[PDB]
Amino acid sequence: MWHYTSINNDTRVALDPKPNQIRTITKPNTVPQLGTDYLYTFNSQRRSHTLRLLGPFQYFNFSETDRGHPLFRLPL
Amino acid sequence: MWHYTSINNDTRVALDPKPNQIRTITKPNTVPQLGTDYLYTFNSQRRSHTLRLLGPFQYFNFSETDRGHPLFRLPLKYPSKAIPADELIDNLHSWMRSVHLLHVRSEDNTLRYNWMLGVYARSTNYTTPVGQLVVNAPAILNYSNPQDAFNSVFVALGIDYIDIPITNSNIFDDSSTPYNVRIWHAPTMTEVNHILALMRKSTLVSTHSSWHWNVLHTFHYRSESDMIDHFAAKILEDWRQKEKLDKGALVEADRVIQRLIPLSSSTYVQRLAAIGALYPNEFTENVLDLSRLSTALLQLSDTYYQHANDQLRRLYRRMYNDSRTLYMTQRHQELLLAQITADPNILLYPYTYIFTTIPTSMNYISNTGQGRIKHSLTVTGATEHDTVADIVLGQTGEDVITISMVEPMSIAVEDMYGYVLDTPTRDIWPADEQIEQKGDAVALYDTKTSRALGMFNNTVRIDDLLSPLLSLVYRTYIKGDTMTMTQGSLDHLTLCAAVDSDITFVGNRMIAPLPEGYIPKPMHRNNSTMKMLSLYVALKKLENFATNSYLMAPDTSIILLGAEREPAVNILRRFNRNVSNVRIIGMGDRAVEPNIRVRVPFPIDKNISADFIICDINSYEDQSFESMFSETISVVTTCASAATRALVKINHPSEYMINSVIERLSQLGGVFYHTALLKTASQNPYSYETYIYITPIAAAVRFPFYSNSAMINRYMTAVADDEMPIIPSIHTVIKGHSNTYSPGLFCGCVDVQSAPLALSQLKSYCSEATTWRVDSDDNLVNIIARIDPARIALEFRTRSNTSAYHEYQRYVPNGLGFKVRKTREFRYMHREVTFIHKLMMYALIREQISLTENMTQVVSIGGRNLADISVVPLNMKYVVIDPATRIETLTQEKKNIEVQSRPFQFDAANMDLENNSIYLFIAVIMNEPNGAATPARMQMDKIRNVATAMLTRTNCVAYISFYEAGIITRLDQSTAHKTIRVEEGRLKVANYVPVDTLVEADVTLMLRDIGITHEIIRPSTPELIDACSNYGIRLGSTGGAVLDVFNHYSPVIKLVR
Amino acid sequence: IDHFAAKILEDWRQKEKLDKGALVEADRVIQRLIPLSSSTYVQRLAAIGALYPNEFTENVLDLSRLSTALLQLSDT
Amino acid sequence: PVEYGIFVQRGATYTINAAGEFEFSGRNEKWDQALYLSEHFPALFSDVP
């Protein structure tokens, strides 16, 4: 059992959408669902909120306009 | 059924009220009711309110005063949620009170009420000339003849027309209307002809084939696109209606040709009128996507503009060149004639051509809406392929397809706690056998067991395998949805293992509701938790088999000798909370509290005893065989001395190890030890590690030593592998007829035109192939298709490359799947144990067959649907003799496969064994052709006949699979057999009728009496790894528990000449 | 330092799975970072991170303050 | 600001398609009259919900 047995693959590339899906990668018609679109949690001991977007959105820079949205005002 | 059968009628006229009803058409006294007076709905996704008034009010213009009413302010008042029904009813009712149409009621029964003009005059607040005419002479709204309803207003106004605004059907949107309708003063057909001919001189107008109130009316659109959406909606309407008339069912159609005629329009509308007139097969087939209907129609008109069919192309072109003419099928025209007969002075569009419809034989498959299509590719078909170009599959995102390494197992919660036993066979242990078995054991241990076995044992851990089930039980307990279960039930144990909190029933079969605001964390489990639980359940099942309750008796104790956290000690302590006096403790050298930390063998001072002991000892340190041996021996020694019911682990269960353990229990004074090998469903599927079960019995144990036992062979047959383990590839290039693909699966995407082609090519390897477009607007179809070795062993027997490509091209574009949801394929799919045993059989027989020289053919009697094809080499001819087999003379001729399609005759006089032949009798000997089980004496008899029949042949090799008797003795005592059973002492594999089993000793004695060369072989561990690798299959838990005892007790007789 | 330490945890776990011989869908064979220019303390982190010390498999280090544990380990 | 974000993500303009469907720009460009003769229209007046 010496030899390593592993399927190496570019997961980050795999995460990049086909261009056609970009129109609806937000899934604008339907609400985001917990555990699929996002992963919210609240550490009551630390009193710290933590929202983690799932899928392609896990890698997402935010324009300062995006930060001005009320969703980011919620933890405060 | 050619003639159309339809009752045409002016529905719009029928909707116009008698004048007397106008006073109360609002029903002012009573509230409007949903579904009768109105139809409110709220699309929460679109966040759009939609109120639709019913009855006469569906056609209603609104005065700006009417819009100032609060009822229209409501959708703005509720941006997010649906307007509450009380507010909707109240406001709609008050506005309904607000409306009052002008009229003069009269006794005449022939009269109607020009509702259109009435509401219109109202909405303008009577400022238009029509409004003045109505406000001064309301009686003018009454009418007997429907047409004169307007002629009266035209003669009275001196105008040649009026131009009515159209209603928006939802009353909430106030958006500007796409077009308006213009009612013309044309009482005679000739006046209508003139107005139409003048209408072709002016932009953006169109009209219906026939008009309501029998008065000519022309739509005038404010923009080209508005005309396009209108025309498209009408083409949908006429296409559906014609679809109902074509089926011949009677229809209450408003007019025979529901679609519009452009009088003046852009090119794109003329195209719409042309394909709309064509009634293309593509609508009936659902080939077009209706989500963007007009676009679909434009593309369709494109395909027709240069159609392969000259008739359809010349017909579409002709329809485009003379769009002002209304083309219609002859069956329509006869309906129009019937209508002219019933109402001689009716107006209907004069310019019309009666083309003969062109038949088309191509039935496209289609199904719009969610659901991937799960193709089953045929091996061969009418299409002849020749040197097909490689079909690259595109890269696909994880947004669409994820590839999990293992399929989590779906299973009933009880099944986890099943186990299988294997009792010892040998009555003695001769010293030469000791030296031999020790040689095999030392030589096996010194060079570590197979790397592929380790890759599987570690890829498919039991903990992640059972995870979704446990987390499901925790998830239902957290919502309070769980309720009833027995105090001792296995479901109670799974519950104790799912959640960290103590559970207490409020009474029999009723657990306590969760305290408010309390959501206890899931119980923490390492990989060996469920296994220890199952060994506990096995101990309770071994003290007596009748039990359903699994709680320990009061004043009794258990030990879990291997310990770290030992979560099972906690789950057990929590499982037995209501039982008085139940000690439960872990006791490892690595033990944490509660569990006592202590080395084994126990210190001479310390006193340890229990009614049960679940050892799980396993030194992490690499070590010499002598030390592993002495350590395991001392472990079993103290385990037996300290308890009446030990359940010791053995990490390296070589025949030498287990037999040495039995020799050691034999050496202890005055206490004979009954013993049995064991393996739970909760063990890792691929672990060869085995639980020996010790217990004193007053009698000396006959046949105490093991030899060629199942649990042991699961270990010893595994050895260092000659080749590196087969990692599952994910192929993206589909070469035509290549036979170069490693085990794994094709996965990816292709343009939908190329989709039928790729299915025609992946058919060579993949046995079945799931596909789906992701959206109606997305042209690519995603495709997943795992490689079946049986399909390869079939398709590559000859160089012909036929397929059902002509069928697959019927699929494009809507016919091959749609699913927005991400799909998660596994690199190692679940399979029932019987199937995996069959693949192990095929691997064993195939490797056995490749070794043989100079063999002309393989004759698999009872070969069913070519199931043994994986065994036979691509060269030699294959022959099936199963009556059940379907006949495919094209596939047979093209793939070199003769098929007898008759029952085999086992009588020796009728026998016809060819020289140089390999006769497969894989699990066919045990059943009659109709499927009823043959009695065991008849089975041994037909084996004797196949044996004697082969005695003459110079070169032949039979492979007669059969079940050994010993398995029934083992499944009488075991629990982990969800599939295999023992109805009245007979084996019952899968869905087959129960069948009596042969005894191996009498069979070997019989073959010795025949004098034929023979060998009773069974598939080994490496064959299992070969099956699982080549097929892309993971073993699962219950399958991994029962596979050893089942596969060891399905020997394949190997007759040879 | 915190980045390097998170990566050393990642490569240590991954190598822990490869050493057991189980097939893994690893993104790359060596998950940990290579300093190109860094302080002494990072060079220490890269060194013990490369070592794959038995101490990680044994859980001898405390991961609550991972980088510190790694510094002390590099000391030993 | 929120509805403004939702609106302007769709685009500050649109073009009616040859099929007659609206096709919004997806971009927040300032309008210029040079566009008045262009295929584009201002998005505020689309009357598309």
Ligand SMILES: Nc1nc2c(ncn2[C@@H]2O[C@H](COP(=O)(O)OP(=O)(O)OP(=O)(O)O)[C@@H](O)[C@H]2O)c(=O)[nH]1
């Ligand atoms: N303002 C107003 N418009 C009407 C009235 N009745 C019919 N219409 C309009 O007349 C146009 C053509 O009349 P119809 O032939 O009866 O309706 P249609 O073309 O079959 O299509 P639908 O009205 O959607 O059923 C439609 O677009 C209607 O909007 C009415 O009473 N008042």
Ligand SMILES: Nc1nc2c(ncn2[C@@H]2O[C@H](COP(=O)(O)OP(=O)(O)OP(=O)(O)O)[C@@H](O)[C@H]2O)c(=O)[nH]1
């Ligand atoms: N009736 C009909 N004529 C067409 C169609 N497509 C092209 N034509 C003819 O071709 C001329 C212009 O050709 P194109 O400019 O290529 O058509 P298009 O607007 O680009 O539309 P597409 O063919 O879909 O690209 C028109 O004047 C038509 O007579 C069609 O779909 N239906």
Ligand SMILES: Nc1nc2c(ncn2[C@@H]2O[C@H](COP(=O)(O)OP(=O)(O)OP(=O)(O)O)[C@@H](O)[C@H]2O)c(=O)[nH]1
């Ligand atoms: N690679 C390596 N070199 C060290 C380490 N500790 C000390 N050295 C060497 O010692 C020199 C400085 O020694 P110290 O000043 O005692 O190190 P420190 O920063 O005080 O760290 P500590 O030894 O934990 O007290 C450095 O230039 C290093 O070359 C270590 O943990 N790893």
Ligand SMILES: C[S@@+](CC[C@H](N)C(=O)[O-])C[C@H]1O[C@@H](n2cnc3c(N)ncnc32)[C@H](O)[C@@H]1O
């Ligand atoms: C495979 S582990 C499983 C332990 C336990 N089943 C649990 O819940 O984790 C077995 C443990 O037994 C301990 N052990 C090894 N040798 C031992 C010995 N000679 N006597 C007592 N315990 C030992 C080891 O530390 C090892 O961690």
Ligand SMILES: C[S@@+](CC[C@H](N)C(=O)[O-])C[C@H]1O[C@@H](n2cnc3c(N)ncnc32)[C@H](O)[C@@H]1O
């Ligand atoms: C176990 S199944 C097929 C064997 C093997 N597992 C396979 O799939 O190829 C055995 C089949 O052989 C057929 N069969 C039963 N008795 C037979 C006989 N006497 N001669 C030929 N075929 C028989 C039955 O119809 C039954 O479906």
Ligand SMILES: [Mg+2]
């Ligand atoms: Mg209508």
Ligand SMILES: [Mg+2]
């Ligand atoms: Mg990463």
